[PDB]
Structure 1
């Protein structure tokens, strides 16, 4: 397992998300589903010129998996996935400019719900999760596990868990007071409110 320091701007973003009083936490789900949808559009687009890009799996879908025993909510997709370079460097570079723009908009009167417009909606996971684990597999790289409980650092390791074929799993280790997001009625309500027209089948798993 390798340990990395978040860039100052992303650490500041995560602290703002964790510390700011903001009751409309439910928007985290649409942000993660939007990232999944963008990932699925990318693999679908690439497959039109190279059909062998779907040898790692033809199905293009999103699964929402609650686990009350583990207190986790997992957002699974069969999108493009992320490489080691994406996890450590590429996406952090993109997140730096988005974070600066989001911070300025917030000072000017914007709301935390607008985070996704700045391309840093992933970090809205910290509205409800004490720890986030990202398991991912891109066609050109190995399966990786990224993880962070904030506090300025994240880890990356090659993942030895169940092989995924292709895609991303975002595992939200929910805060003790955010267990409503494990309830079927609550997830169904949020999906219908904010994610009803996503162009991929969203399956809400139950227990």
Structure 2
């Protein structure tokens, strides 16, 4: 298990997200679905010139999987996935510009315009686990409960084929995001034109 320190500006951003009073927390889902959509666009584009890149799975989609027993909301996609090196994700300029925009009157919902929307997951999650599998590499598990560090390890869990899975270990007061009606409402409000099927699993 390898432990790394976040870049100073990212640790500052994560503390801002965790500490700031901001009621509109539902925007985390739009950000994560947008990231999945980008990864799906990338495999779709790459697979035009190299169709063998789909040997690890032809279906391009997003699954939303709530689990009330584990208090987790999982966002799974069959996008391009990330190599250990990719897992390189640069965000310095975006973070600086976002924190500068907040000081000038922007709100936390504009986070995606700065390439750092992933960190909005910490509005609702005490811990985030990201499992990823790229064609050119092994399956990896990234994880952070903030506090300025994150870990990376080779993942021994169920093989994914290709893509990325974000597991949000929800905060005790944020279990509304495990409810079918609530997730449906959010997807309809913020992610209705995403160009891939979004399947909301039932428990």
TM-score, shorter chain, exceeding 0.5: yes
Partner of 1:186: 182
CA–CA distance in structure 2, aligned partners of residues 198 and 6 of structure 1: 31
1:79 aligns with 2:79: yes
Using the size of structure 2 for normalisation, the TM-score is: 0.99
Aligned residues: 203
Q: What is the CA distance between 1:18 and its match in structure 2?
A: 0.2
Per-residue CA distance 1:58-93 (angstroms, 9 max, x = gap): 000000000000000000000010110122xx10xx
CA–CA distance in structure 2, aligned partners of residues 112 and 173 of structure 1: 21
| Equivalent residue for 1:112, pick from 90, 100, 108 | 108
Per-residue CA distance 1:171-190 (angstroms, 9 max, x = gap): 00000000000000000000
Counterpart secondary structure, 1:3: strand
Q: What is the CA distance between 1:155 and its match in structure 2?
A: 0.1
Q: Where in structure 1 are there 5+ consecutive unaligned residues?
A: none
Counterpart secondary structure, 1:203: strand
1:161 aligns with 2:152: no
Q: What is the CA distance between 1:95 and its match in structure 2?
A: 1.3
Counterparts of 1:43-192 in structure 2, within 5 Å, are 43-87=43-87, 90-91=88-89, 94-192=90-188
Counterpart secondary structure, 1:82: coil
CA–CA distance in structure 2, aligned partners of residues 25 and 82 of structure 1: 27
CA–CA distance in structure 1, aligned partners of residues 16 and 187 of structure 2: 25
Q: What is the CA distance between 1:96 and its match in structure 2?
A: 1.1
CA–CA distance in structure 2, aligned partners of residues 138 and 116 of structure 1: 24
Runs of 4+ in 1 over 3 A off after TM superposition: none
Using the size of structure 1 for normalisation, the TM-score is: 0.98
CA–CA distance in structure 2, aligned partners of residues 27 and 45 of structure 1: 27
CA–CA distance in structure 2, aligned partners of residues 65 and 125 of structure 1: 15
Q: Where in structure 2 are there 5+ consecutive unaligned residues?
A: none
Counterpart secondary structure, 2:86: helix
For the aligned residue pairs, the C-alpha RMSD in angstroms reads 0.4
Counterpart secondary structure, 2:57: coil
Per-residue CA distance 1:108-130 (angstroms, 9 max, x = gap): 10000000000000000000000
Per-residue CA distance 1:118-173 (angstroms, 9 max, x = gap): 00000000000000000000111100000000000000000000000000000000
